[PDB]
Design a protein around this ligand. Structure first.
Ligand SMILES: [Mg+2]
Ligand SMILES: [Mg+2]
Ligand SMILES: [Mg+2]
Ligand SMILES: [Mg+2]
Ligand SMILES: [Mg+2]
Ligand SMILES: [Mg+2]
Ligand SMILES: [Mg+2]
Lengths: 136, 104, 55, 84, 175
RNA sequence: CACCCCCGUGCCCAUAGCACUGUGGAACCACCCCACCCCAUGCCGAACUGGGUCGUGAAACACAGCAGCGCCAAUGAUACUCGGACCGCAGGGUCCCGGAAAAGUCGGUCAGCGCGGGGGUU
RNA sequence: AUCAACGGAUAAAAGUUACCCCGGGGAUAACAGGCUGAUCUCCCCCGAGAGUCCAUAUCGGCGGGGAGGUUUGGCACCUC
RNA sequence: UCCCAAAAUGUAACGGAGGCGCCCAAAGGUCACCUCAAGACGGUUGGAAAUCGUCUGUAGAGCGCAAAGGUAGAAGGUGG
RNA sequence: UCACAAGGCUAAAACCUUAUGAAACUCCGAAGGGGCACGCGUUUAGUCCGGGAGUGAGGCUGCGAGAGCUAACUUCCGUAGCCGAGAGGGAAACAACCCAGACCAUCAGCUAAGGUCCCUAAAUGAUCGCUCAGUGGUUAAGGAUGUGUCGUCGCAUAGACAGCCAGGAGGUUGGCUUAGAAGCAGCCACCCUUCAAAGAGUGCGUAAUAGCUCACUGGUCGAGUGACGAUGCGCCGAAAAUGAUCGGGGCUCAAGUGAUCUACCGAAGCUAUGGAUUCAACUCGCGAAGCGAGUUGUCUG
């Protein structure tokens, strides 16, 4: 969810995924195919969805984190200063990045659990597995 | 500490001066009192005490300063600047200078 | 090295207009025989896309 | 006069005219005095025949030709190698 | 494994079923143009722990091991392969797949088997005498049971490149 | 640069650095020794500084081994990008043409070139 | 010399006008339109859970994608 | 002062942050000398840091105030 | 430095393995850019002094950012180009986009961007393909045995997928959980017997039962058939107010669309011929500069 302390406000720009493997931690994973701003509540939706589906275990790895402040329209204005810090927190996610990875659950127990999570996401995704050895 | 030699050495602003450097290794009872030209990595004069001192070790103080002042004067070395190690400029070392200052 | 101005200088960046001026080409169709020196070959590479190069 | 602050928190108009940088580069015929660098600390330290002003500014002592010495990075020097 | 050309102009292979690769040791650093389909079909079998005889254009058979693969992001398809030219008697440090065997008297109780390190770095095994897998018994484990480096069997004359107390397989609780 | 070695000083600031193992002593160098005064410790001769041997090379220094750590670091492919030319409502993306990283990997190193003085080749 | 409104109009200076007057401005607000669509209105996706039992007869948490241009606005483009 | 500022300089906004309107006869000149923050182990007030001791220790300290640059061969810290 | 993901570890700070984010982080670090010297070259401006100014509302687009909703025909910078002050062709129409900078004349010629069924200049062009929705000629999540081409996993003439005959498990109304929970509200497992075979079993039915089927098993049959993914073109999703439409007619019997190839059209661009102007060097009429004439070059929104 939100971060503990920081600077307050930010900016915005885009280009292809930097630090996001495929394996590590889990067996199966979920990968972004489009660039986006993944809201805090958007992840918190996916966690809850996958969490419920597995019942007991909690073997879900949330690789993405909302390390980004977004501002908003108090009511109308423009005549006046910079805008409200407290709209939402976001994680900039570029194609290739692993957002979520699952452990111990079966192939299908994961195909479906991720399918449900996809429906709570603002972008196209795909499920992944093994053969990713860069560093371990 | 060791910072003392590099402090005294760096403050002896090398080729800006034009003048020659006068080293002293007063750490032992065997000097080196070398005359080093800043520019070329070359030593011009130099007067030690290792081979013959006449018995003296901290007493040879002026002798080796007087020896060098004479040794330099042959080559025509007139303009020079002294550089101590961590040496406080007082006894064995102050003599070598006061003997060169008076010895030409 | 035969060079001819085939595209217009209008809407093209300053430097490219200035190069096409140095190369002595004033109209479209304008052709000239050129030096095999690195700077004169260098001018011809700057405005390559505006010229038709024979050899 | 109310109990609220004399100075209102959260501003941003604040900034300053500001200058700086290198004035003479590697391979330039300088006259004596000609400033070679404007700097904050000692990005470039004074070399052979180059003086350092109060504000770490580097000026020429004698006419010549500017040579830059980049000792591995962290220790940098500007010196003059006269044409005469 | 077979291949053709090796220049720095790759437009002749770009669209085609080819992957540009390299092989090095300390003598010959030969560039490649191998088949994507063949490399994929075979690399998936052998991984880093295994090696294969690579014959260039004509006939120059060479034994080589896979060092690193730099795949394209977006589309998980590989784009560049790095081969290491194998000597005869001594190899490098190889990351070995840590697999599991049997059920745990903890997994059935409430928890599950969690392999912390999926691949393990091992010192001087010997080439063509490299372990293709790494079977580890888990049955003895309950809840709070960890297995470090100094708990794994190494097949004949092998040593661990990783720290003695580095957690490999730990059985975790529910929820 | 006769060949070695030691003490000074330098260009060169890690491909020169550290740790760990070793060789070195009566030539040099260190500790050591005493110190009332020159002169000195916001307290103490630890340090500076003065007067000298032995003793011991312990510690420090000097040299030599070694790749465990540091440090250097390719080739290939890539990110990015000048210029040229395009897609998509947009976020964004592509093709040609040259320039081309960073990280990583192969692998490289327990430095190299001086000036002066000292001591040995019984 | 908080000449600090800091290139500093005089040594020396606050308000009000619905009683208002002139010169101008679509360089600039209020109405309408235009562009936009946050908000507004509708619609779709997923399916937790409610429906004694059964996700989908009805209902649809958390979250996601659109359409419209009737709201409040933004913006200030013709019209002072 | 920093960021915006597109690796020369410069560059706007009722863009993001923060400080100044001083202080010091030593906090200046010069000449000498000194070397930091922190951790681990061990020690009377104490017991979280602390006055001491020994190992590690390019700086993780300091620089009268904001920050950036810089800086231990000192710009840091002591004295004549 | 600040933020941060799984684990180790210890009394959490530190520390270690794996893993990341950064305008105000940086051990690194381009492409570019800037200064200077040289001109190996090719060009044609610049500087200084003095007279006269006007202009100090800019606008769009691309690219790089902030503000703003990664809204605006929005705002404020950077940078290039055009309009401003720019005619001509194209883009139906259309400051800005694309092509191209108009000295004058011609009932001549070649080309650019764009085009070549008829309106309307020029191939109803050639070849191998795609789509059948008028897509072309209104957007998305999401959805789908739509056709085209390449890949991955299997099952097979020792006879599979589908289809009909026929069997359907004994234990056991598995334990728990309950007012009952029996293959089918939820917690733990998915052990066994007979064999040609039947899984503490998928969906419906009852209040719990039963019913009626599947996962599995033979005969009859005979030849390929079932699932994940990639991609090309298409489908659904797809509702706004005066009367409709891609400019229109009309087009699949391509006039749509992917790739290659030529031939023609097409401008005030280039060219041909004639003439005029500007500056220049070169000739000359004159007592001299200079003004006239006269070539050649160049210029002329
Ligand atoms: Mg490195
Ligand atoms: Mg280019
Ligand atoms: Mg470009
Ligand atoms: Mg566009
Ligand atoms: Mg390229
Ligand atoms: Mg209005
Ligand atoms: Mg999209």
């Amino acid at each position: 969810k939100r971060t503990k302390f920081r600077k307050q406000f930010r900016g915005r720009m885009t280009g292809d995924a930097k630090g996001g493997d495929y394996v590590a931690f889990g067996d199966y994973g979920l990968i972004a195919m489009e660039p986006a701003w993944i809201k805090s509540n958007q992840i918190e939706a996916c966690r809850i969805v996958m969490s419920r589906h597995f019942r007991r275990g909690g073997k879900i790895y949330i690789r993405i984190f909302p390390d980004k402040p977004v501002t908003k329209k108090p009511a109308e204005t423009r005549m006046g200063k910079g805008k409200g810090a407290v709209e939402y927190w976001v994680s900039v996610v570029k194609p290739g990045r692993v957002m979520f990875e699952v452990a111990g659950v079966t192939e299908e127990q994961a195909k479906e659990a991720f399918r449900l999570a996809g429906h709570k996401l603002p972008i196209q995704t795909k499920m992944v597995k093994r053969e990713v050895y860069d560093e371990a | 500490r060791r910072k003392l030699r590099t402090r005294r050495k760096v403050r002896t602003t090398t080729a800006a001066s034009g003048r020659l450097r006068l080293s002293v290794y007063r750490s032992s009872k065997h000097i080196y009192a070398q005359i080093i030209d800043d520019s070329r990595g070359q030593t011009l004069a130099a007067a030690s005490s290792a081979a013959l001192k006449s018995g003296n070790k901290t007493d040879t103080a002026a002798a080796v300063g007087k020896a060098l002042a004479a040794a330099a004067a042959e080559k025509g070395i007139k303009q020079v600047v002294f550089d101590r190690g961590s040496y406080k400029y007082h006894g064995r070392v102050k003599a070598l200078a006061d003997a060169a200052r008076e010895g030409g | 090295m035969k060079i001819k101005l085939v595209r217009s200088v209008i809407g093209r960046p300053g430097n490219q207009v200035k190069t096409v001026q140095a190369l002595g080409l004033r109209k479209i169709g304008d052709s000239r025989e050129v030096s095999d020196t690195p700077a004169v070959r260098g001018m011809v590479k700057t405005v390559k896309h505006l010229l038709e190069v024979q050899e | 006069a109310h109990k609220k602050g004399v100075g209102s928190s959260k501003n941003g108009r604040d900034s300053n005219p500001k200058y700086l940088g290198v004035k003479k580069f590697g391979g330039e015929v300088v006259k004596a005095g000609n400033i070679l660098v404007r700097q904050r600390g000692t990005k470039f330290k004074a070399g052979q025949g180059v003086g350092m002003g109060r504000d770490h500014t580097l000026f020429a002592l004698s006419d010549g030709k500017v040579v830059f010495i980049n000792k591995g990075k962290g220790a940098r020097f500007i010196s003059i190698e006269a044409a005469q | 494994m077979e291949l053709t050309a090796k220049p720095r102009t790759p437009k002749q292979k770009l669209d085609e079923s080819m992957i540009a690769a390299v092989a090095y040791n300390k003598e010959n650093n030969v560039s490649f143009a191998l088949d994507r389909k063949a490399f994929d079909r075979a690399f998936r079998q052998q991984s880093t722990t295994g090696l294969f005889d690579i014959t260039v254009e004509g006939g120059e058979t060479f034994p080589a091991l896979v060092k690193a693969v730099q795949m394209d992001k977006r589309k998980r398809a590989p784009i560049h392969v790095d081969f290491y030219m194998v000597t005869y008697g001594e190899p490098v440090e190889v990351s070995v797949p840590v697999h599991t065997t049997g059920r745990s008297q903890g997994e059935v109780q409430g928890g599950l088997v969690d392999i912390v390190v999926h691949n393990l770095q091992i010192v001087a095994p010997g080439p063509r005498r490299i372990p293709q897998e790494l079977v580890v018994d888990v049955t003895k484990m309950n809840i709070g049971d960890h297995i470090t480096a100094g708990d794994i069997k190494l097949p004949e004359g092998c040593t661990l490149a990783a720290d003695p107390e580095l957690t490999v397989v730990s059985v975790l609780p529910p929820r």
